[model samples]
Every structure is written in C-alpha cells, then in structure tokens.
Target: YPAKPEAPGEDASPEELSRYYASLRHYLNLVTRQRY
Candidate 1:
C-alpha cells in the first residue's frame, strides 16, 4: 500500500508538517485500536 503524502516541502511550515504527522499518528492509533 502507498504511504500517506506529506505536506509539500515548498509551502509546508514546521507547525503544519508537525500537525500533519501528529494527525496521521492519531488516526493510525485510533484505527488500530478499533474493534470494528
């Protein structure tokens, strides 16, 4: 499976990129823990 895309380097601020990864990690953990 293809990996999720990161924010584009050109316009990606540190906060934006950090938030993106944090969001991805939170989503991954959420899905992994789901019983459905």
Candidate 2:
C-alpha cells in the first residue's frame, strides 16, 4: 500500500484553475471600473 494519499477526483486541472482565476480577476476589474 502507498503511504501517500491521492486526491482521486481532485480538480487540479489547468483549465479549471484558469477559469477560476479568470472569474476572480474579471470581477475585480468590473468593480474597479464601477468605482465601487
């Protein structure tokens, strides 16, 4: 048996991470533009 545990279905895919960051940055940019 392996000593280390695996994430199994852990969502560490590049596409998923990229989409998450993009949403965050987009939201920040929108807020900045709105001057809120």
Candidate 3:
C-alpha cells in the first residue's frame, strides 16, 4: 500500500488540517480499492 502523506505543521489551521486529511483519505481509498 502507498504510505500515508505527511501531516501539516503542529500549528496548522483547521482548514489546512481538514484539507490534508481529506487528501490522505482519498489516496488511501484509491490504493486500497485495487485489491483482487
């Protein structure tokens, strides 16, 4: 499986965190769904 992406800085704003998390989840779903 593809490695999870890095997180934003500790002081990142809520919007930044949300966008990062959404991207991470999107990547995970695409890779994880390729199983036989």
Candidate 1 local lDDT, 1-28, one digit each (tens): 4355543468778878887877677656
Candidate 1 residues lying further than 4 Å off, grouped into runs, are: 1-10, 34-36
TM-score ranking, best first: 3, 1, 2
**Candidate 2 lDDT by residue in tens digits, 1-31:** 5333333236678877766666666655654
Instruction: Kindly list the per-residue Cα lDDT of model 3 for residues 1-36, writing each as its tens digit.
Output: 337787677798998889898987787787666547
CA lDDT of each candidate?
0.65, 0.56, 0.78
The regions of model 2 sitting more than 4 angstroms off are: 1-11, 34-36
**Pairs in clash, predicted candidate 3:** none
User: How does each model score on TM-score?
Assistant: 0.46, 0.45, 0.56
In terms of lDDT, the poorest run of 10 residues in model 2 is 1-10
Sort the predicted structures by lDDT, highest score first.
Answer: 3, 1, 2
Q: Point out the higher-scoring one by TM-score: 2 or 3.
A: 3
Highest lDDT: give the candidate number: 3
Candidate 2 clash pair list:
none
Query: Which candidate ranks first by TM-score, i.e. highest?
Result: 3
